[PDB]
Structure formats: structure tokens, C-alpha cells
């Protein structure tokens, strides 16, 4: 049998529904989102970290001249200097006086500690939602993971639950995402090849162990001044370090909907947003004939004292008369009241306590003890506690949220105005007919 619900996507809150087939005893349905994963499709561009400025030993063909060449090393900078006469510990390093040429080389590497302290630049496409469900039908519990797309039939044994499309398309990640030691940032990194000196991504490589590193770190080779051999150079600050100082707070702390940002793989777990249209094809054997379940002769609902809060702030006793003992499913036929119980034991004459939760200031709902709908009426006072540590089990509607005293006053005012204008219209027509008969 096919049942189409709409489960609120809040992890942990059970969603209760009653499936009634003609000729078959009502079955209790219980859908819980144990966990959720928002996994985007990732694409790694490059890996960046602090650069190691490698200055080789200066070359002095120092009676003659040297030529600058081209190398594939990262940010390979070269410069030829006119007349040097370099010194070391030992005096003059060659013979001709001002015919001495020094070649300064400076490229960029990956720091030795980069295998631990590095960032990964990623582009993430549309995200996919996957949920863990705890469908409880009858007295059988089934755990199962389904894709939230509307077509994939994730099934544990014989449940065949199809998770409909999520009502709201939400993704806490931007197009470009930076991952550094497990912390996820939304950064607009430069593309592969567009290295900006002094900014994030000034040194790029496909991997840490790659030999095709590309860099642009603004290395300016300066003319030596001192007599001792020297490679004077100046450089821009590490873009990785500058970004680390100005990174802001991660997505783990700036995420919406209480999302838990996790890595390996990148995902946003336990996000509370939207509604999921679940469709369950319950196996036939779970249902039982209407003859097998006990039949309620008459029942009546009295509600002890209720508040409308997140937790189960309500109590309810109903006196029933059953002709046979057995188990009967209990359900609240209302969107603003949810029962804590699902099945209960009925024994001839008895009374049972059912705890519920409400968002309206009225227990104005219906309860079914394996059929035999009965109505409750009471006053739900506001809770004394201001802050609780548990999510609200029921959403806040309008006709429910407005109480009956306020409804009575509103209808008194509006109906007074409407009756006033109706009396005005009737005296209008009566006076008009009197005038028409006058002349």
C-alpha cells in the first residue's frame, strides 16, 4: 500500500502518521531523520602553502660575461650584474678587475612542512542530500539511507521508500571553497595560472609532490653592494600566510541552518531545512485484518493540563471500553499536536495517559484509539520557561496559534461591523421601496 507523507527535515524529531486501509486495522507510521549529508560534487584545482625561496650559489664567470636563460622552476628570476669583484674568506675570487659578471638566481619551492600545513582549492557544484531514516511501521523498525532526489528507491529489505525532492534548494558552500586542516572557508581563489603576488594562491601546484609548480611571488633581484659574495633580493609576503591572518571565521561557524561542516569528503551534516515528500510502500503482511484488532465501543478524551512548548508539555487520559484485549495504535489527527506514544495496551474498561506537544494555545484536536475518533477541548497556558534545549516538535500555524477567546473577540468586532452594514443595507432597500411607492 502506498502512503505519501511530507516529513519536516529536522534530524531527531519523529514524524507520526496513521495509514488506514479499508478493511484493515490502522497502522502506525514513524519517520525519523537520524542523520543527513549534503555532499557537493568537488573538483580540486591546486594546492597552495608557504613558499621556500631557493637562492642557489651565485655563479661568477668573472672575467667575461654570462647570459640569462629560461627555466621551468617556479618564479625563476635571473639577473646579470656588470662588474662585481666578489670576496669570500680568502680574498679576491678572480683576476680581472671590472670584467666580472655575477648571475643571481631565485626560484620558489614548497616548504618542508607543507605536507601538513597546506590548503586545497576546490570548486563545488550542486549538492546532493542523503538522509538516514528510521521508519517504524507496526512493530518492525527499519533503518535505511536514501538519496533525496525523487527517483532513487533506497530500500533496506522490503520498504521501498522514495525520498521526494527537497522543497528548498540550499547549499552552505559557495562555488569556490578552501580547505585548510579540516576548516572550510568560502574564498574566491585565483584560477589556475592567475597567480597574484601577495594573495592566496600565489604558488600553485596540482599536488604537493608535483614538479610542475607555478608561482608568482614578486622576486626582485638587487645589485650587490658589499664586497662579500651576496644575492640581495626582496619579495612579497606569503599569500598563504596573509590569508591565514585574514581568513575570517570558517563555514563550521558561519553556516546556516545549524549545518555541521565536515571534510573527507566535504559535506554539511544534520542540516534543518525544508520538507521531504517521502513515499513508502509498506509490505502487505504488516497490515492486519480489521477483525483481528480489538474494537473500541466508546471513548472520551479529557486533558489534564497543557502548555505549548517544544517538549511534551501535555497530558491526556481517555476512558475506553473494549470487548477484547490487544494493542491499538494511537494518533493525533492534527498538524499542531503530536503524540509521544504510538501503540498502547487496551484491556476491557480502562484509561491510559497520552503525552503530546502543542504549538497552539488549545488542545482542540482529535485522537484515535485504533479508530473511534474523539475530540479534546482545554486551555493551553503559555510555558513558564523561556529557553529550552530541544527543538520545537510542531510548526506554528495561524488558525491554531490564535486562541478561541481572541477568535471570539475578533469575530465579535468583525461581525458587529458586518451586521451593522447589513442592517444599513436592509434599511436602504426598505426606504427605497417606500420612496418608490410614495411617488
Amino acid at each position: 500500500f502506498e502512503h505519501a507523507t511530507t516529513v519536516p527535515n529536522v534530524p531527531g524529531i519523529p514524524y507520526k502518521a496513521l495509514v488506514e486501509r479499508a478493511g484493515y486495522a490502522p497502522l502506525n507510521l514513524e519517520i525519523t531523520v537520524v542523520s543527513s549529508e549534503l555532499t557537493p560534487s568537488t573538483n580540486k584545482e591546486y594546492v597552495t602553502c608557504k613558499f621556500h625561496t631557493v637562492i642557489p650559489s651565485p655563479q661568477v664567470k668573472c672575467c667575461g660575461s654570462l647570459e640569462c636563460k629560461a627555466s621551468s622552476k617556479a618564479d625563476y628570476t635571473c639577473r646579470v650584474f656588470g662588474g662585481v669583484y666578489p670576496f669570500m674568506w680568502g680574498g679576491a675570487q678572480c683576476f680581472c678587475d671590472s670584467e666580472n659578471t655575477q648571475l643571481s638566481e631565485a626560484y620558489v619551492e614548497f616548504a618542508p612542512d607543507c605536507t601538513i600545513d597546506h590548503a586545497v582549492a576546490l570548486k563545488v557544484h550542486t549538492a546532493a542530500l542523503k538522509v538516514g531514516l528510521r521508519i517504524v511501521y507496526g512493530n518492525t523498525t527499519a533503518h535505511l539511507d536514501t538519496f533525496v532526489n525523487g527517483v532513487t528507491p533506497g530500500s533496506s529489505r522490503d520498504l521501498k521508500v522514495i525520498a521526494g525532492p527537497i522543497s528548498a534548494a540550499f547549499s552552505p558552500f559557495d562555488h569556490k571553497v578552501v580547505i585548510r586542516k579540516g576548516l572550510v572557508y568560502n574564498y574566491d581563489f585565483p584560477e589556475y595560472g592567475a597567480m597574484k603576488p601577495g594573495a592566496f594562491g600565489d604558488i600553485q601546484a596540482s599536488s604537493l609532490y608535483a614538479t610542475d609548480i607555478v608561482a608568482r611571488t614578486d622576486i626582485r633581484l638587487l645589485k650587490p653592494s658589499v664586497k662579500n659574495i651576496h644575492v640581495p633580493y626582496t619579495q612579497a609576503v606569503s599569500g598563504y600566510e596573509m590569508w591565514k591572518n585574514n581568513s575570517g571565521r570558517p563555514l563550521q561557524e558561519t553556516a546556516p541552518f545549524g549545518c555541521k561542516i565536515e571534510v573527507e569528503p566535504l559535506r554539511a551534516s544534520n542540516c534543518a531545512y525544508g520538507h521531504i515528500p517521502i513515499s513508502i510502500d509498506i509490505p502487505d503482511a504488516a497490515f492486519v485484518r480489521s477483525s483481528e484488532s480489538p474494537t473500541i465501543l466508546e471513548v472520551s478524551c479529557t486533558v489534564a493540563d497543557c502548555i505549548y512548548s517544544a517538549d511534551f508539555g501535555g497530558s491526556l487520559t481517555l476512558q475506553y471500553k473494549a470487548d477484547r484485549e490487544g494493542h491499538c495504535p494511537v494518533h493525533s489527527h492534527s498538524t499542531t499536536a503530536v503524540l509521544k506514544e504510538a501503540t498502547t495496551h487496551v484491556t476491557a474498561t480502562g484509561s491510559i495517559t497520552l503525552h503530546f506537544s502543542t504549538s497552539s494555545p488549545q488542545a482542540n484536536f482529535i485522537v484515535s484509539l485504533c479508530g473511534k475518533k474523539t475530540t479534546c477541548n482545554a486551555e493551553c497556558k503559555p510555558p513558564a520557561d523561556h529557553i529550552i534545549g530541544e527543538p520545537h516538535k510542531v510548526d506554528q500555524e495561524f488558525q491554531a496559534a490564535v486562541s478561541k477567546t481572541s477568535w471570539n473577540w475578533l469575530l465579535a468586532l468583525f461581525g458587529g461591523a458586518s451586521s451593522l452594514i447589513v442592517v444599513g443595507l436592509i434599511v436602504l432597500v426598505c426606504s427605497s421601496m417606500l420612496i418608490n411607492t410614495r411617488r
Binding site: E253, G258, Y308, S309, A310, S359, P361, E379, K381, P382, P383, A384, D385, H386, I387, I388, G389, E390, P391, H392, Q396, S403, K404, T405, S406, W409, L410, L413, F414, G416, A417, S418, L420, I421, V423, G424, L425, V427, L428, C430, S431, L434, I435, R438, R439
Partner: protein, 104 residues
């Protein structure tokens, strides 16, 4: 120190140092009684939803105003066209039978 943070029906998560996050949700504990006198009801629903309750109260004020000024306008129109068309006609006499039934 002390820090004041606003909590709503959706919740709030705060992390203090190297502590596990703790989440808190706000209940509808507005001052007043939703089932008391109208002023207590208005206090409750103004603390809960101010703009909505202002809209509803302005709606009832407009409904009473436009509707008392409409029934009264129609009443005055009927009075005028019951007193003028032949009763107030110069040198004309209207006895009690067709005067006092609506007039005065």
C-alpha cells in the same frame, strides 16, 4: 563579562572555548495570558508577534470605523429621504401614523 544573545523559534548555538556546542530554542513565553482579558491577550500577542498583532488591531479599528460610519451614513440617508420628500414639503401635513414610525 556578560553577553546578551537573541534566541528565536529556530534556535541558537554557542561555543565557549574548547567546549562542545550547546543549542537553545525559545518558547512562546510572552507576558500575559492568551485566554485572559483582551488586554492580557494583546500584551501576549504583541510580545509574540508585534507587526502581526498591530495589523490585526488596526484591522478591527478600521472595521469598526468603516461600518459604523457606513450604517450611520445609510441611516442618515434614509432619515433624509423619509423626512424631506413629502413630510418637509412646505404647507404639507404628515400625521403621527407615517411620521413617528421612523422619525424622531
Amino acid at each position: 563579562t556578560s553577553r546578551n544573545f537573541s534566541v528565536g523559534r529556530e534556535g541558537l548555538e554557542y561555543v565557549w572555548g574548547n567546549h562542545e556546542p550547546v543549542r537553545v530554542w525559545a518558547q512562546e513565553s510572552a507576558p500575559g495570558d492568551p485566554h485572559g482579558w483582551p488586554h492580557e491577550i494583546i500584551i501576549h500577542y504583541y510580545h509574540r508577534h508585534p507587526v502581526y498583532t498591530v495589523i490585526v488591531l488596526c484591522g478591527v479599528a478600521l472595521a469598526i470605523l468603516v461600518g459604523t460610519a457606513s450604517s450611520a451614513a445609510c441611516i442618515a440617508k434614509a432619515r433624509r429621504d423619509c423626512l424631506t420628500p413629502y413630510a418637509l414639503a412646505p404647507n404639507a401635513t404628515v400625521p403621527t401614523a407615517l411620521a413617528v414610525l421612523c422619525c424622531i
